[PDB]
Every structure is written in structure tokens, then in C-alpha cells.
């Protein structure tokens, strides 16, 4: 086509989606990770995670307001990944890298799994 | 903070949101523009437009499944702007620029209004 493109548009959209999440506006699901609860937008979760994409395209699970994750999932690892979904920024630290990588593998977030593997390999 | 950032994350999210729109997955509103209907996600509309942000934060309008736009709004101008919301690409042409600018002014999409004004000024 002969379209023009606004470079900062995708980033501005994600910033506003994160502002809606922070104010709990039009969030339609709560993700339960052991004792912890995280409110989010199903569309953003699907757009970032192969696991959520599979869950919310399922004809019965698409209508659930609560999703319980596997008990082995660490709430902090989930929190860090949820923040990454809504910001593009990943808070990867020596103290959380193992939990973040395991959570990213479960959530099917291949770019996160890739950077965790590289950061671990460099420390070996 | 000490975060790392994935450059293509915002663009990848928007691409997936557009794929969900194309397959009519988790769309929660229909925008009526005279004889034409457009299905979309309320969160994306709010993230892109000052008008939709005001409508869907309203305690009664947030629950509507149908929104009717002003009869002066051109369906093609709306279609072009809806495509821009979901892709960052604006199909701006001599034959549609007036309708696109008027629709962007109504929808409160200031970056679109700005490029339309500049493109019009250059042709004068």
C-alpha cells in the first residue's frame, strides 16, 4: 500500500493499556497464582503468551473470570512477566532469573525464555 | 530501575490484537457509523482515541455493546482510522484526507489530526 506509519503508535497504545490496568479499567480476568491475585485484560494476556492465547480461544475457558495457574508457579515471577507484557520492560535479576525463566516457559513467552537462557549461560 | 527492554514487544502486541480483531476474538463492542458496523475491543479504542476513552470510562456507557457515532461521520474515514488504531499505518489519500481529518478531530486522535493538517497545508 501507500500508507504512512506513526513510529510511536504501538508504544503509546501499550502505555495506555498499562494505565487502564493500573486503574483497574475494563480488566476482565483475575489470574490466581497460589495466594496472589492479578487483574488483567484477556486480550493483552493472549497477545503476549502462547498459554493465554490457547486458554482464551477455548470455547469454555474464554468465559471464565478466574484462571488458576499451576501451584509450582512463583507469584513474583508471574508479576515480573505481567509487568513485561504491559511495558516491554523485564526486571531480570540474579535473584529472580530462575523463577522468571520457569514462568516464561510455562506461559510460552519465547523471547523472554531466550534472554533468560543467554543471561544464565553468561554466568556459567 | 535496572530493567532490559524488548524493542519489538509493543509492535508484536499490536499485531496480535489486530489478528484477534480480524478473527472477531473477544471483541466487546460494535461501532455503528450510519449503515456500517465495525467490531472492536473497547480497550484498544480507549488507548487510541480521546473520545472512546471518555465514553468507556463513563459508568453507564462502559457497559453498552453498541455505540452510535454522529451521522456526519463518514464510514470510510472511520474504517481508515480503526485500521490505524490496530496497525500504526494510516491510508491517507487525496480522496479521503478531508473525511479522515474530520473523523480524527471527532475521535480526538491528535497525531492523525496533525499529519492531515500538514498534508493539506503542503497542497495549498
Amino acid at each position: 500500500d501507500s500508507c504512512i506509519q506513526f513510529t510511536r503508535h504501538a508504544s503509546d497504545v501499550l502505555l495506555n493499556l498499562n494505565r487502564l490496568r493500573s486503574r483497574d479499567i475494563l480488566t476482565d480476568v483475575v489470574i490466581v497464582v497460589s495466594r496472589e491475585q492479578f487483574r488483567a485484560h484477556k486480550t493483552v494476556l493472549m497477545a503476549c503468551s502462547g498459554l493465554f492465547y490457547s486458554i482464551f480461544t477455548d470455547q469454555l475457558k474464554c468465559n471464565l473470570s478466574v484462571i488458576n495457574l499451576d501451584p509450582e508457579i512463583n507469584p513474583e515471577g508471574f508479576c515480573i512477566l505481567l509487568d513485561f507484557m504491559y511495558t516491554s520492560r523485564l526486571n531480570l535479576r540474579e535473584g529472580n532469573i530462575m523463577a522468571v525463566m520457569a514462568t516464561a516457559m510455562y506461559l510460552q513467552m519465547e523471547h523472554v525464555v531466550d534472554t533468560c537462557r543467554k543471561f544464565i549461560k553468561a554466568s556459567e | 530501575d535496572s530493567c532490559i527492554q524488548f524493542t519489538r514487544h509493543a509492535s508484536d502486541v499490536l499485531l496480535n490484537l489486530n489478528r484477534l480483531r480480524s478473527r472477531d476474538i473477544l471483541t466487546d463492542v460494535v461501532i455503528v457509523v450510519s449503515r456500517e458496523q465495525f467490531r472492536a475491543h473497547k480497550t484498544v479504542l480507549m488507548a487510541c482515541s480521546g473520545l472512546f476513552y471518555s465514553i468507556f470510562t463513563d459508568q453507564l456507557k462502559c457497559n453498552l455493546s453498541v455505540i452510535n457515532l454522529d451521522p456526519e461521520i463518514n464510514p470510510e474515514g472511520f474504517c481508515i482510522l480503526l485500521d490505524f488504531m490496530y496497525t500504526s499505518r494510516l491510508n491517507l489519500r487525496e480522496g479521503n484526507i478531508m473525511a479522515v481529518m474530520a473523523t480524527a478531530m471527532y475521535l480526538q486522535m491528535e497525531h492523525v489530526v496533525d499529519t492531515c493538517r500538514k498534508f493539506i497545508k503542503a497542497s495549498e
Binding site: 506509519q5 506513526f6 | 494510516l90
Partner: peptide, 4 residues
């Protein structure tokens, strides 16, 4: 704005 750019030419993509």
C-alpha cells in the same frame, strides 16, 4: 510519521 514515516514511509514504512
Amino acid at each position: 510519521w514515516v514511509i514504512p
